[PDB]
Structure formats: C-alpha cells, structure tokens
Amino acid sequence: DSRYEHVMKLRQAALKSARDMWADYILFVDADNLILNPDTLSLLIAENKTVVAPMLDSRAAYSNFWCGMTSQGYYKRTPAY
Amino acid sequence: DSRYEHVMKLRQAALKSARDMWADYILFVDADNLILNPDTLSLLIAENKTVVAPMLDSRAAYSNFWCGMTSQGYYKRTPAY
16 A cells, blocks of 8 residues: 555656646656657657557567456456457 | 846846746747737737737837848838838
C-alpha cells in the first residue's frame, strides 16, 4: 500500500509539473519499458487522441493493452485480445 | 542613448523570457496605451501572422503605423498613409 501510494503521488506530481510549464503532451514511460522503434513519438501523436498508448509487445501474451475489466478491475479475457 | 539602451535591454529580456516558458504569442503594451476594445487580443491572434499591431487612435495624424522610412529611419509621408 505504501509503495502504491508513493507511486500515485509521484505520478500526480509529474502531471502537475507537466501542467505548470504549458507543456503539450507527456509520455510517462517507466524504466522497464524500452521504446525500440524510432517513430514512437512521431507516429503516436499523429492520431489526435486524448490518451493514445503504444502496443508494447513481449515474448508472451502479456502486454500493455488490457481488453476489459470484469467486476473489480481484474483482467477479463475478451474475445478480441 | 543610455535610455534607448536600457529600453532595448528590457525588451530583449521580455522576449527572452517569452521563449523560456514555451509560450505562443507575446503582447508588449506601453503604459500610455489603452485598449478600448476588450476583444483586441483575440482579433489579433485570429490574424494568423508573425507580427501584428492594431491601429491605435489619436487626435492627430500620428499613429503607431508608419508607411515607410526614407533612408535611415526618417518618416516618409507616403500617400497610402
């Protein structure tokens, strides 16, 4: 709980600092992720979206794009994942 | 000449500060100027030009718009003025 609260506070502080500089767009990419392709920030911002996210693949099914919350935020295997 | 240097330095400081805030458009208004129309800023922004300046009224033919300089900054009374 303490770690989650600290992470939430840090993320909100990052958002607040991103708002005070009149800065358009913000890409809060964590340390574990690795943006391999060069056209990430070039192609991603070209869709005029509210919060657009990139499809980060991996060695298995798990990725950064859930397909639906069932009852309490748990991952629900939708028929399109 | 010292007054001119100080005024130019102040204008340069304002311009430099206007680009450290990642802002768009800068309005430098003199103390003796009064904006009668409250919608002047929106109309000026809607002009879609690099540098703009509206026509400030005066009791005489003198205005904030010069029709041209002759050789070294002397006023040239062009017929279009």
